[PDB]
């Protein structure tokens, strides 16, 4: 069974440099060209680079946005393709996939590369009280990097929870979570959200109180 | 060069659908070796068609690539529920590729469900920082496509709003969220705030009176 598996992604500041690796198996990697293609929110799919066969002298082509900063290469001894990225920019942020064969039949799982000059920042957590069943929430504002883990009543409130995707606003991420509980239990009983941000090593509780 | 696709399409299972792909430079021909790639939940990508109409190995016979007028096209004959996914096309321009924006395909695999909307006002704690964020959560809708529109005292906002891409819930319905970011001054100055979510031609709205 064919398998492409990327590697090497991480967080980097603008000006940074990193090398991604992709190892192929379950087919004759040497026989096909390989490409790098990245996925970003603001840009959908963007083709970045291709590399041809040994018999093509390992010839390559690059997207204009990457020319002069990125270099694709391969080592058939290792069934691997690679992407050396230099002079990284925040616009290079995205999930990077190696993919190939007629002409993009195979895709690896992808590796995330984040380019940001932002410093670690614990979230400021804000309770969201309503303006039979009642919905309460929590705003987790202005943190960096991701992830963050959000629980309700230490996880005892398991059902009725909704946690949404982080948005990037101001070089910092913001997400929200919400719980729906029977109005008979709030505000008579306490509803608290527990937010953990491993990076800042913080763990905050915020009680939802009526406005 | 810009490659354009339809943003979303809906179909009942068993019917045929055609997605198209156009080039901003002119007609798409066999020289563009159009590819079609499928994305299933979790960034799972798989190539369906290469070189205009060559189906990748293992891909179901119901998938066919072709050229219709000046565009490349993907046709799914007798679409199945397992085909709800996003479809990208890529076009070759001599020595580089340009990908399209992707078409979200819905293959009605359950009964339609309207979004449940909840709008939250800015907290007092946040306001102290001279900032006000209104949160609009949106859950349990199917199809998973919604447009979110924010209004302040009845007027449409075009700045400071940010919406997340629907994501599937365990029950295969979808969820999403939107945010309106205001200064505290803007927040105190208006009485009416509204999050309006259009899903299949019907708008579900929540409002705050301040």
């Amino acid at each position: 069974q064919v398998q492409l598996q990327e590697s090497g992604g991480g967080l980097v500041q603008p000006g940074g440099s990193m090398k991604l690796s992709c190892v192929a198996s379950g087919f004759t990697f040497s026989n096909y060209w390989m490409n790098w293609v990245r996925q970003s929110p603001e840009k959908g799919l963007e083709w970045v680079a291709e590399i041809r066969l040994k018999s093509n002298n390992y010839a390559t082509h690059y997207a204009e946005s990457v020319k002069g900063r990125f270099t694709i290469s391969r080592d058939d001894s290792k069934s691997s393709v690679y992407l050396q990225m230099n002079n990284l920019r925040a616009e290079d942020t995205g999930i990077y996939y190696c993919t190939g064969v007629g002409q993009f039949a195979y895709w690896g799982q992808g590796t995330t590369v984040t380019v940001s000059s932002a410093k670690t920042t614990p979230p400021t957590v804000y309770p969201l009280a309503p303006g039979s069943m009642v919905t309460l929430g929590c705003l987790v504002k202005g943190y960096f990097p991701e992830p963050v883990t959000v629980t309700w009543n230490s996880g005892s409130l398991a059902s009725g929870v909704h946690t949404f995707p982080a948005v990037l606003q101001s070089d910092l991420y913001t997400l929200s979570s919400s719980v729906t509980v029977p109005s008979s239990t709030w505000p008579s009983e306490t509803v608290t959200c527990n937010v953990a941000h491993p990076a800042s090593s913080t763990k905050v509780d915020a009680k939802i109180v009526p406005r | 060069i810009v490659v354009t696709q339809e943003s979303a399409l809906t179909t009942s299972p068993g019917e045929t659908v055609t997605l198209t792909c156009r080039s901003s430079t002119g007609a798409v021909t066999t020289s563009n070796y159009a590819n079609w790639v499928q994305e299933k939940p979790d960034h799972l990508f798989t190539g369906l068609i290469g070189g205009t109409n060559n189906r990748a190995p293992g891909v179901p016979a119901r998938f066919s690539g072709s050229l219709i007028g000046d565009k490349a096209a993907l046709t799914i004959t007798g679409a199945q529920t397992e085909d709800e996914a996003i479809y990208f096309c890529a076009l070759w321009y001599s020595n580089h590729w340009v990908f399209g924006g992707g078409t979200k395909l819905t293959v009605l695999g359950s009964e339609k469900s309207s979004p449940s909307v909840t709008l939250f006002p800015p907290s007092s704690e946040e306001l102290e920082t001279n900032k006000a964020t209104l949160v609009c959560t949106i859950t349990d809708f199917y199809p998973g496509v919604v447009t979110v529109d924010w209004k302040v005292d009845g007027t449409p906002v075009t700045q400071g709003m940010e919406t997340t891409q629907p994501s599937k819930q365990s029950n295969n319905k979808y969820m999403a969220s939107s945010y309106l970011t205001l200064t505290a001054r803007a927040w105190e100055r208006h009485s009416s705030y509204s999050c309006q979510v259009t899903h299949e031609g019907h708008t579900v709205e929540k409002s705050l009176s301040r």
């Binding site: 096909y32 291709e50 064969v101 002409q103 | 070796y33 070759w92």
Partner: peptide, 9 residues
């Protein structure tokens, strides 16, 4: 000039 048109495994 064409992309990689070799048949997939």
């Amino acid at each position: 000039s064409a992309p990689d048109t070799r048949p997939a495994p």
